[PDB]
Amino acid sequence: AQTVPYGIPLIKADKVQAQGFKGANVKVAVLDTGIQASHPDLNVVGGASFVAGEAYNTDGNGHGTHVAGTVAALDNTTGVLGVAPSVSLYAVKVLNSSGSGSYSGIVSGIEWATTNGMDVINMSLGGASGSTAMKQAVDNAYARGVVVVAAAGNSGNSGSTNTIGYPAKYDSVIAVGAVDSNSNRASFSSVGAELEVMAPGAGVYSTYPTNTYATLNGTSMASPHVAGAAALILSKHPNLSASQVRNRLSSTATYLGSSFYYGKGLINVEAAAQ
Numbered sequence: 001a002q003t004v005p006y007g008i009p010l011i012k013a014d015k016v017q018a019q020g021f022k023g024a025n026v027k028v029a030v031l032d033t034g035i036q037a038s039h040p041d042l043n044v045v046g047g048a049s050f051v052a053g054e055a056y057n058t059d060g061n062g063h064g065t066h067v068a069g070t071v072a073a074l075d076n077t078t079g080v081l082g083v084a085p086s087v088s089l090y091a092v093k094v095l096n097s098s099g100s101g102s103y104s105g106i107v108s109g110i111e112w113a114t115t116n117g118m119d120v121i122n123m124s125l126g127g128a129s130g131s132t133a134m135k136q137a138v139d140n141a142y143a144r145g146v147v148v149v150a151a152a153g154n155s156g157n158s159g160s161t162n163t164i165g166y167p168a169k170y171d172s173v174i175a176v177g178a179v180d181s182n183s184n185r186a187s188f189s190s191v192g193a194e195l196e197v198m199a200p201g202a203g204v205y206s207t208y209p210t211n212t213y214a215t216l217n218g219t220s221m222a223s224p225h226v227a228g229a230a231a232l233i234l235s236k237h238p239n240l241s242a243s244q245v246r247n248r249l250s251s252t253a254t255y256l257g258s259s260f261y262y263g264k265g266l267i268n269v270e271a272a273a274q
């Protein structure tokens with residue numbers, strides 16, 4: 001009836017669930033291509049779009065809907081199952097259907113998130129170039145107490161230079177790399193000094209636009225696992241601070257090898273939990 005993507009158990013998300021922490025009352029913003037709000041396995045409570053012509057609540061390129069579901073695919077009897085399935089899910093359309101977005105849109109979405117008390121902002125996007133304004137709203141939202149997790153980049157290596165994109169590069173931002181089920185670091189996952197931690201990003205099955213489910217690969221998929229794991233935690237210790245929450249994801253994870261390639265390693269939600 002319901003399937004459990006090999007990733008919820010991998011990060012021991014499901015052991016937190018058992019205890020009864022699933023992110024109830026936790027507000028997660030997914031800054032993506034949008035979310036098919038009519039998807040039987042998802043319940044989007046609100047949002048916004050800064051993409052022109054595109055309304056939001058509709059997904060032209062299956063990504064937003066896929067990332068959305070990893071975070072909150074409802075806990076029912078069908079489809080899949082998200083990380084923090086009780087969570088208040090807001091979709092911020094920041095990628096115009098062909099998958100790309102301009103900073104103006106990104107920074108706006110970020111701002112929106114902060115201005116609407118979003119406890120979590122998931123950015124499964126990037127660029128190899130930054131901007132002054134992005135660094136400010138990522139720093140600003142975090143100083144504001146939001147937890148900002150962003151995908152690392154789907155660059156592999158680039159010598160021994162950082163292949164981590166933006167905004168993941170902003171140390172106010174948690175850069176998430178991708179592993180698989182044998183906790184092996186995905187091939188395409190980005191390396192750099194900024195990598196923070198790893199999450200499942202290979203062959204991750206989730207909600208796909210028009211009430212169906214599919215398997216995609218990427219850091220883009222790695223990032224949301226981290227965005228839910230914090231909601232869970234935020235649902236157990238609702239007093240904690242962003243940094244309070246980060247440290248725990250950080251300094252309490254599973255060692256896979258060098259920081260360059262794996263960061264602090266694979267997240268452990270249970271241990272981080274408390």
Ligand SMILES: [Ca+2]
Nearest residue numbers: 074078079080
């Ligand atoms: Ca479900």
